[PDB]
Structure 1
């Protein structure tokens, strides 16, 4: 508990949409940060969150190339501007669901 925290809320870097909160960071496999690459070779510093808002989840889930064993993913866009912010994971265990958001696509700031 601190007065006037500046590192409280994550917003979409491109538009400001409210997306998540530092309090909702989730240490999957012991770390909230997972460094991964996709089939196109892009490297992502993914932060895992229990909860997020302000996104639009696109399509139906897929297990293909999943970075997290037992989870299927859907692309998560900023619901306001369409920026690709990460993925929603579902279908797994403990937790059943979570979000993996691309750290450098978010801005962190006060509540």
Structure 2
């Protein structure tokens, strides 16, 4: 029901906050594959830098790197500047732990 940072246990999100498919399998320009779950809402992150559109997986959205606010582990990206919705989070599924 709750998603925590796999590395340190920081509270991040909830199954209830998943945003549809909620799963997207993508590759960055360094050829790294991420299984990304989209969330309407997340907490306990630190958004680093200003947004960029470069190589955005989601048409009309700019991304900022989302670290775990506690341990600094890269948990995914915040997406902004789009429409329906304006903002959402793309979190790397295998860097989260699910439970009570």
The structure 1 segments of at least 4 consecutive aligned residues displaced by more than 3 Å after TM superposition are none
1:23 is paired with a residue whose SS is helix
| 1:104 partner SS | helix
* Shift in Å, 1:42: 0.2
Write the distance in 2 (CA, Å) between the matches of 1:34 and 1:90. 17
With normalisation by structure 1, the TM-score equals 0.90
Query: C-alpha displacement at 1:98, in angstroms?
Result: 0.1
Shift of 1:72: 0.1
TM-score (norm 2): 1.00
In structure 2, distance between residues paired with 1:70 and 1:46: 17
- After superposition, give the CA deviation of every residue in 1:21-74 in whole Å (9 maximum; x if it has no partner): 0000000xxx00000000000000000000000000000000000000000000
* CA apart distance, 1:14: 0.1
Aligned equivalents of 1:109 and 1:54: distance in 2?
17
Shift of 1:94: 0.3
Aligned with 2:3: secondary structure?
A: strand
Question: Which structure 1 residue ranges, 5 or more long, are not aligned?
Answer: 1-7
Residue 16 of structure 2: SS of its match in structure 1?
Answer: helix
Matched positions, count: 100
1:83, 1:77 → 2: CA distance? 5
Higher strand share: 2
Larger radius of gyration: 1
Match of 1:10 in 2: 3
- RMSD of Structure 2 on Structure 1 (CA): 0.2
